[PDB]
């Protein structure tokens, strides 16, 4: 009810847009220019997990200048480390998100192509920069009235070369089953789940728990059983666990997506593949026939490799204190 923002008098809060665990976000008018922005107020220092997720998010948004990744305009610079308790992020205001869109809008096949195309274009530049999102889902794909789509929520992101997730409905089977939880392929799997949801207008694998999630997945793509099917699973315990589950042959996707564009079904088949090494890449998906209306190889940024040190904190195992987290964010804001 009573929300306080200690920010520049140049801004005038308009309305409360959301209140999450992370904190709150309000739309605001930058008085001098009349421009509208979203201002996120975060109080992460008594919530370690959120302080670290906020740090990843700030570093990544500040780094990219891409049409399909949320733009950050500025971050309030605090005046003293001692009284540094709130983080204010000024970013672009987006109208809604793909979750809300799938739940309320009648989408044409053209809408679907356009949304998955933009999603993959963002994934391509991230992957090419050695960034993997790791938690892609419809609610993380922000959208505006003209259908522009921008990726956000890089809290579980990592730089390539346990954890908590809100849901595993969009998580790759090999990620669930093995220690290979940091691949480019896991993001393509999530994109395949998003593409399927656009067609079905409901999640394709809404598991009730860990085992049931795999049961739903395999009930559609087929339960891997042969030494070839399982060649990609290095762990013997994982292969045994898979072998202990009910086993069924793959289900014919066309039957599941009767009135869907055959090219869309082909792209989906290439994304929802158990073996990550056989899964289509973001770049290859962009060149797929289904997306020919929007594909332009001269306008799909490849990215530039970011060194692992970008997220140096991920490579140290000493316990982090409240002060250490404040220092990490402080340092990032001022440099």
């Amino acid at each position: 009810k009573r929300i306080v923002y200690n920010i520049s008098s140049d801004f005038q809060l308009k309305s409360l847009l959301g209140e999450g665990a992370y904190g709150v976000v309000c739309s605001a008018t930058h008085k001098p220019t009349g421009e509208i922005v979203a201002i996120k107020k975060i109080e992460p220092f008594d919530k370690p997990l959120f302080a670290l997720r906020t740090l990843r998010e700030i570093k990544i948004l500040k780094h990219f200048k891409h049409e399909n990744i949320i733009t950050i305009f500025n971050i309030q610079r605090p005046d003293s480390f001692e009284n540094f308790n709130e983080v204010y992020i000024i970013q672009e205001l987006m109208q809604t998100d793909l979750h809300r869109v799938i739940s309320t809008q009648m989408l044409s096949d053209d809408h679907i192509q356009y949304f998955i195309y933009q999603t993959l274009r963002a994934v391509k530049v991230l992957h090419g920069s050695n960034v993997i999102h790791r938690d892609l889902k419809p609610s993380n794909l922000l959208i505006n009235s003209n259908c522009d789509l921008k990726v956000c929520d890089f809290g579980l992101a990592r730089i390539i070369d346990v954890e908590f997730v809100a849901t595993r409905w969009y998580r790759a089977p090999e990620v669930m089953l093995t220690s290979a939880k940091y691949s480019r392929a896991m993001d393509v799997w999530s994109c395949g789940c998003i593409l399927a949801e656009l067609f079905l207008r409901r999640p394709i694998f809404p598991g009730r728990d860990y085992r049931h999630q795999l049961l739903l997945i395999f009930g559609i793509i087929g339960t891997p059983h042969s030494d070839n099917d399982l060649r990609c699973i290095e762990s013997p315990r994982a292969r045994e666990y898979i072998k202990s589950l009910p086993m069924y042959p793959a289900a014919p996707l066309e039957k599941m997506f009767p009135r869907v564009n055959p090219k869309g079904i082909d792209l989906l088949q290439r994304m929802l593949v158990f073996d990550p090494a056989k899964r289509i890449t973001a770049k290859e998906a962009l060149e797929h026939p289904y997306l020919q209306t929007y594909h332009d190889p001269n306008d799909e940024p490849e990215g530039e490799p970011i060194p692992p040190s970008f997220f140096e904190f991920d490579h140290y195992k000493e316990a982090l204190t409240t002060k250490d987290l404040k220092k990490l964010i402080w340092n990032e804001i001022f440099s």
Binding site: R2, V4, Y294
Partner: peptide
């Protein structure tokens, strides 16, 4: 200058034809 502000609480176009 930073000041405190308080606040008390409570159409999708067609996609572009060609790229």
């Amino acid at each position: 200058p930073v000041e405190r502000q308080t606040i008390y609480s409570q159409i999708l176009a067609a996609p572009p034809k060609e790229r």
